[PDB]
Design a protein around this ligand. Structure first.
Ligand SMILES: Nc1ncnc2c1ncn2[C@@H]1O[C@H](COP(=O)(O)OP(=O)(O)OP(=O)(O)O)C[C@H]1O
Ligand SMILES: Nc1ncnc2c1ncn2[C@@H]1O[C@H](COP(=O)(O)OP(=O)(O)OP(=O)(O)O)C[C@H]1O
Ligand SMILES: [Mg+2]
Length: 372
């Protein structure tokens, strides 16, 4: 009953997979420095725009003079039509709207894998690590439209990010449906900035959407943060590790694409909550996760936010080529792991398990002969 054991292959912080995935302190500090840069500029742009609104409260300035004031701020890094729109929105505000804007100071909170500590070093060329830093606009509760304006809020956050891109060589701006993004290719890094409306201080946490039908959706990122932290407490310290490993698998199997990180987390928590496993052998634990993921994904992976009816990964009847590919690779994973376990030699064991996680771990002495 001889096997190969991979517990150190997975967990070793020198040169096992944890060692290869976890950011160095310098890398983490660089991301925190990037976050601060964005936060300070967003703060500044809002103070600048408020200064113009303050002037208009004092005196009903002409549109031309408001434009001139806009053009001397960071908003100058938007397009001509975008600057005109900002000036027009400030010109068009009634007294109550203007007073609400003059009271607005954006707040910030990091979400995603930087926040709950599952951010992996990227693997393939082109792949990037990111930090997701949300900007929050405290304002009165609204049903349909806020008393400051979706359009103005997005223009000002865009102005912030674009002003930074203009000042930093090798930085590039990208608009997404749920965020503005600064990409820094040479640093294999981007920062995503989702924007939320919240009350002036979960049902009233509203994510801004860039294009389409709905300008807002109720999506409180703290629901996911709290669910995952609670899950780590409930299941144990290995949950963060196996979530990292499943994301590393995804990065190795797909250059571009694959299932979302949050779908992997949700399915893995469901499996570990409901299936016996042993944290002293994370090789066996990974095999157990891999055996059960196909069924989790085939039925559709539900969001931990119960108010979100949209699945994190759709059920089988809604699959196209991409979802079919994901199912195929999920089905292959337990077979890869099983073959690695019974390989003829340590070097073949390493070669095989690296077909799941990529050729990152090279130290075959992390794999030891065992019985199972
Ligand atoms: N479909 C979704 N439903 C609800 N929240 C989502 C969804 N996709 C992303 N989020 C929110 O955004 C956060 C960041 O997402 P994302 O960058 O995809 O994951 P992550 O956990 O940061 O993993 P990576 O390490 O970046 O791959 C996590 C969650 O609070
Ligand atoms: N409820 C939500 N639904 C979707 N995305 C969300 C939600 N809440 C926050 N986000 C933001 O979306 C970001 C990742 O979304 P996504 O648009 O899938 O980027 P991606 O994973 O690079 O894929 P694409 O760039 O869209 O192909 C991370 C997070 O900051
Ligand atoms: Mg992220």
């Amino acid at each position: 009953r001889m096997t190969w054991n991979f517990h150190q292959y997975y967990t070793n912080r020198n040169d096992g997979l944890m060692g290869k995935l976890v950011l160095t302190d310098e890398e983490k500090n660089n991301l925190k420095a990037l976050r601060k840069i964005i936060r300070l500029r967003t703060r500044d742009v809002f103070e600048e725009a408020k200064g113009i609104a303050k002037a208009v409260k004092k005196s009903a300035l002409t549109f031309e003079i408001i434009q001139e004031k806009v053009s001397t701020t960071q908003i100058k890094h938007l397009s001509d039509s975008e600057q005109r729109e900002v000036a027009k929105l400030i010109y068009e505000m009634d007294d109550d709207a203007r007073d609400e804007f003059l009271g607005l100071t954006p707040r910030f909170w990091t979400q995603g894998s930087f926040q709950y500590d599952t951010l992996n070093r990227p693997f393939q060329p082109g792949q990037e690590m990111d930090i997701d830093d949300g900007t929050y606009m405290p304002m009165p509760i609204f049903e349909s439209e806020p008393k400051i304006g979706h359009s103005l809020l997005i223009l000002l956050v865009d102005a912030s990010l674009k002003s930074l891109v203009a000042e930093n060589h090798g930085w590039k701006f990208e608009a997404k449906q749920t965020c503005g993004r600064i990409k820094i290719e040479a640093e294999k890094t981007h920062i995503d900035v989702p924007m939320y409306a919240i009350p002036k201080d979960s049902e009233n946490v509203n994510l801004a959407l860039r294009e389409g039908d709905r300008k807002w959706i109720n999506s409180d990122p703290k629901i996911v943060e709290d669910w995952f932290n609670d899950s780590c407490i409930r299941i144990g310290k290995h949950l963060r590790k196996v979530c990292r490993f499943m994301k590393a698998w995804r990065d190795a199997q797909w250059d571009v694409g694959g299932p979302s990180s949050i779908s992997l987390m949700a399915a893995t928590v469901n499996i570990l909550d409901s299936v016996a496993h042993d944290a002293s052998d994370l090789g066996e634990t990974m095999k157990i996760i891999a055996k059960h993921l196909p069924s989790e994904f085939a039925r559709g992976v539900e969001s931990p936010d119960s108010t979100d009816e949209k699945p994190l990964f759709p059920p089988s009847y809604k699959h196209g080529p991409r979802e079919m590919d994901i199912m195929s690779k999920l089905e292959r994973l337990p077979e890869i792991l099983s073959s690695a376990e019974s390989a003829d030699s340590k070097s073949e064991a390493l070669k095989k398990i690296n077909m799941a996680f990529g050729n990152r771990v090279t130290n075959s002495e992390l794999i030891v002969l065992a019985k199972a």
